[PDB]
Design a protein around this ligand. Structure first.
Ligand SMILES: O=C(Nc1ccc(C2=NNC(=O)[C@@](c3cccc4ncccc34)(C(F)(F)F)C2)cc1)N1Cc2ccncc2C1
Ligand SMILES: O=C(Nc1ccc(C2=NNC(=O)[C@@](c3cccc4ncccc34)(C(F)(F)F)C2)cc1)N1Cc2ccncc2C1
Lengths: 466, 467
């Protein structure tokens, strides 16, 4: 990794574009309000600070590699070799940058300052926005954590309504997304962001990221159970689906086991194979080791409702203290196909209308959870708000005539508690009036060192639901 | 990197679920047809083979790390330590796997085998599908290359129609997506996939990936020009936008230079600042060093058409030999906001209806090009189609009653040219009847070695448009 090659090409040319005698560039990150995701989990900057920004990030060799690449890339010698040599010689390759940030896991309304960046040496005025590209990739862990939290809110509401408690809430949305993301690095970041809110993952890459960058008191931040795939059922042959199911639930007799049941006919598998031929191997299992039947095709709501209606007529169903139907504790369902925040809401509402407890169901989500998200969903954006030029500070901003939603904030920013205990971003250095007490941003990075950090356990606490 | 920790958790348990006495698992990858992205660029597998699958990928230390993690993760000791030790001791940690693939850059219709995977040692029947998760991530470079190519087709059609050639086609869609992707690793892979079809990138990460994994005869696979951002304009102050523009075009007098012009009022910047106050610094510039005006907000079609209407009244417009209007060569426009395959089509059709040449415009795309894509867009999917159990081969598949589109192929697969020059995937080992040409799948990986590689130059040639 070479930070000289980890910016948008055009930023290589910015040191020639700022007003002459500019000693300070001060820039901020927000999830811009779009005058429905009203609050965001701030998570993921600490990963970036440690993996990419801290310590000696400049060497002789990195400067020469970048020089040689940019000469060809631009067909011209526009690279700031002198500016990067300055950092190597004055600071042993440590970035003279100060970043202030809201604590990780914090849950903040749209349109607030989340972090700020500024150069600490006048010579490095160009450096603040060099690192915009790398820091703005924060959008991804923020957006995965936020969208996973919104899904937890829906699950919380319906589980509380149909059961009278939240037992098992943190295992209700399992991460199926490892194959469905764009890379290994993405797998680990996105899986880690989902584990801010839940404990169930198949995306193994998330576990090592958490242990190296954040830390947990527990040995691991997330858990799984044995489960089949189409290959482990269909490999027995089209006439032997029963043989496959029997061998798998017998191999995994004393732990929970998920068994994909839609290879040929989900409704026949539920009613005849599980519900009649193999019923004796299901009703014997312990409460700690249920069979989880997994449909994987068809309309997600219609399929879930028919699977439950089938199982309800083959297995002894109870009515819980809320009046909702409940499968025996040895038998559960997981819908792991077509789940995103919209279909999840549809399935739990539909279950509730048919008097099925959300105790009966778990969800798996892959692309919906980790991939089908963009920087646009929360308007994650980094902008310059303040510069010093000829020793005078100026409040700077954009305000495009055709889109007032892209207006940016002015001047030096701070984050405060309101008298009602909400959040407000103060602009134009007005935080210094101290009419709203102390800035909630903390210095997290300064002059190549991480100065403040959060365990994963602290992050989970900050991100809890009301 | 530990390949023992680079699979979906449940696959750690699959070695206990396959039929006993199974000596072979054979699986394939396709972009399943949904019975419109009718053809897919196969690109990206070579990166995965070299970065993650080749050489000694198993050590004593990796097996113990995986053992310790899976113990806690499953609350149980279900990990296949003996199976992974077998690979370490018999093959010095090299995977006994054979992968066959269509050549990279090939352009293949939906619903065809692109690559196959099978174990070369009976002991390692479980290994074929262990590596499903890592191989299925090839969806991403395939889908970025495919979607970038479909955009090149749209640009090709409209540029040929409004100008009578394709000059500059390979610079018409610039990658703006570095900040808009989910990771550094993703930036490099997605940027490299876009450069299969175009030469203009700001996503620097793509250049080193191409040089390390593919290689080009040219020094670099992709190029950029100097350009402003809101910070380099707004830093001058709200009352000095004109000073910022003047200093920037004067700093970059002799090369092309893109200047974001919507900080306060794009229409005032075009009509009064560029079109009157600074016009003398624009009309002097060379054909090799145009000013590119960059709007960055509003309705993308409406804003492009009004920018061109303004510039057409302040600058000398010509009518090209097709009847379409053309800005002077020192002046161009780039729309780099809200561009995806749908808005791109809308803008060029709108320009065509208003008699503007596509010569006037370049596009920048960020999230649309590199991030707003999923494995579902081309139904990229990996399935087991053949096993050997008790020495007998059987053709296996799924065929869910409620979704016939998820039906999978049966048996040993091969890819062939049809008598009309199309493609066909043969099932059930029917390739061995040799009623069609050679199988187009080549061994690219075997027993821990990459056996066949493609230069990036070969991939660009394979992925060219017809015309
Ligand atoms: O079906 C898959 N995995 C799976 C299925 C169900 C659950 C459960 N979630 N939630 C729960 O509460 C269960 C559960 C009960 C008791 C103790 C559990 N311990 C740890 C966690 C879950 C526990 C419930 F059985 F009670 F539903 C089980 C977890 C994972 N697959 C993995 C995968 C990956 C990629 N693509 C497809 C698939 C299929
Ligand atoms: O505007 C940006 N960059 C940029 C702008 C225009 C082009 C051109 N594209 N296509 C071309 O044909 C141009 C062009 C002509 C002549 C020689 C060129 N040489 C190399 C390539 C482009 C050449 C055209 F001037 F003719 F339009 C110029 C390339 C990059 N930005 C970079 C960026 C990154 C992230 N976010 C926002 C931005 C803004």
């Amino acid at each position: 990794f070479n930070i000289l090659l980890a910016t948008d090409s055009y930023k290589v040319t910015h040191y020639k574009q700022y007003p002459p005698n500019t000693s300070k560039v001060y820039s901020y990150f927000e999830c811009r309000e779009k005058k429905k995701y009203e609050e965001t989990v701030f998570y993921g900057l600490q990963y970036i600070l440690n993996k990419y920004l801290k310590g000696k990030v400049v060497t002789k060799e990195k400067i020469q590699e970048a020089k040689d690449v940019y000469k060809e890339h631009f067909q011209d010698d526009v690279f700031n070799e002198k500016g990067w040599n300055y950092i190597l010689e004055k600071y042993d390759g440590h970035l003279p940058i100060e970043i202030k940030a809201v604590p990780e896991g914090f849950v903040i309304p749209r349109g607030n300052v989340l972090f700020t960046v500024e150069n600490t040496d006048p010579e490095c005025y160009w450096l603040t926005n060099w690192i915009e590209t790398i820091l703005v990739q924060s959008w991804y862990p923020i957006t995965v954590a936020t969208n996973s939290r919104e899904q937890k809110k829906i699950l919380a509401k319906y589980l509380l309504e149909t059961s009278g408690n939240l037992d098992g809430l943190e295992y209700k949305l399992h991460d199926f997304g490892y194959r469905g993301v764009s890379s290994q690095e993405t797998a680990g970041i996105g899986a880690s962001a989902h584990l801010v809110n839940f404990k169930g993952t198949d995306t193994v890459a998330g576990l090592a990221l958490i242990k190296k960058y954040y830390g947990t008191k527990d040995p691991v931040p997330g858990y799984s159970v044995p489960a089949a795939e189409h290959s482990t059922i269909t490999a027995w042959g089209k006439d032997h689906e029963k043989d496959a199911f029997e061998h798998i639930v017998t191999q995994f007799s004393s732990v929970p086991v998920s068994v994909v049941s839609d290879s040929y006919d989900i409704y026949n598998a539920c009613e005849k194979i599980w519900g009649e031929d193999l019923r004796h191997l299901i009703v014997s299992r312990s409460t700690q080791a249920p069979l989880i039947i997994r449909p994987d095709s068809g309309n997600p709501l219609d399929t879930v409702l028919k699977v439950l209606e089938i199982l309800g007529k083959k297995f002894p169903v109870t009515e819980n203290s809320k009046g909702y139907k409940l499968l025996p504790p040895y038998l559960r369902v997981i819908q792991g196909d077509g789940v995103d925040i919209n279909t999840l809401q549809e399935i739990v509402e539909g279950m509730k209308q048919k008097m099925w407890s959300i105790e009966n169901i778990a969800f798996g989500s892959g692309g919906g959870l980790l991939q089908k998200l963009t920087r646009d969903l929360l308007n994650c954006s980094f902008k310059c708000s303040y510069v010093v030029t000829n020793g005078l500070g100026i409040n700077v901003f954009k305000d495009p005539v055709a889109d007032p939603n892209k207006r940016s904030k002015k001047g030096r920013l701070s984050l405060h508690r309101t008298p009602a205990g909400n959040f407000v971003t103060l602009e134009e250095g007005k935080g210094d009036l101290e009419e709203y007490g102390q800035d909630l941003l903390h210095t997290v990075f300064k002059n190549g060192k991480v100065t403040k950090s959060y365990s994963f356990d602290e992050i989970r606490k900050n991100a809890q639901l009301n």
